[PDB]
Amino acid sequence: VQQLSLFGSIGDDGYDLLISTLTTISGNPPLLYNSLCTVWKPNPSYDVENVNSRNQLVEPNRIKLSKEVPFSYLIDETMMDKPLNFRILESCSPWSLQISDIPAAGNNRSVSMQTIAETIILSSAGKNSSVSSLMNGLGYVFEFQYLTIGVKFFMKHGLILELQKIWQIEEAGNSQITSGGFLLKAYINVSDIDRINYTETVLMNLKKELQGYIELSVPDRQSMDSRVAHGNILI
């Protein structure tokens, strides 16, 4: 899968205006939604060479597990997650498993284009059937996880618009990565060059239609790269 996208943002106060605008522009009011994502990385205690059976270089990457959480269980899975039996309300739940590549290279790209390998986990059984054990069985460990809540809009040609808020989850507390406003995302998922240039056009027309009001641009490739690497001191 190829995901073509553009991003933007607005502060909390810009909410109502944006919702009103997207509702008129798309013809439908927003739809509430959420998702919990847990990111996993190769176990650092284990170490393997980074090469094929064909002796070809393989880059270590993170695996992303995602699914929706009923809103009624939201506090339970975030704040009150620990003390297992301290709550308000067998096998693993279904999950979406994804590994993505750093977006396609190119100066003056009209949109971001990212390849995404995904498979679906439906269930489990056996000794260690928890999704956590299963990830460990693959040689991975839990790294971090975040909750995203927002509204989406279905538009023409498969264009989708998400207005989102993101919270990282830890016992020490959830911190809002998007504190201040909403992360705006417009995208289309593409399973032929044509449909790719057509999809770019759809995104470009949406960008054009919001120019002046809210700007949508291509984020930095490096900001969309989940590959594992070091312990680098930033700047």
């Binding site: 991003f7 993170r62 201040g180 900001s223 969309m224 930033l234 700047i235």
Partner: peptide, 22 residues
């Protein structure tokens, strides 16, 4: 409000910045 790139970078790698970069 915040830096789009930084927010995205977090969702893809988990890093939060206590300092301003670039």
């Amino acid at each position: 409000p915040f830096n789009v790139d930084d927010v995205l970078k977090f969702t893809f790698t988990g890093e939060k910045h206590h300092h301003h970069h670039h």
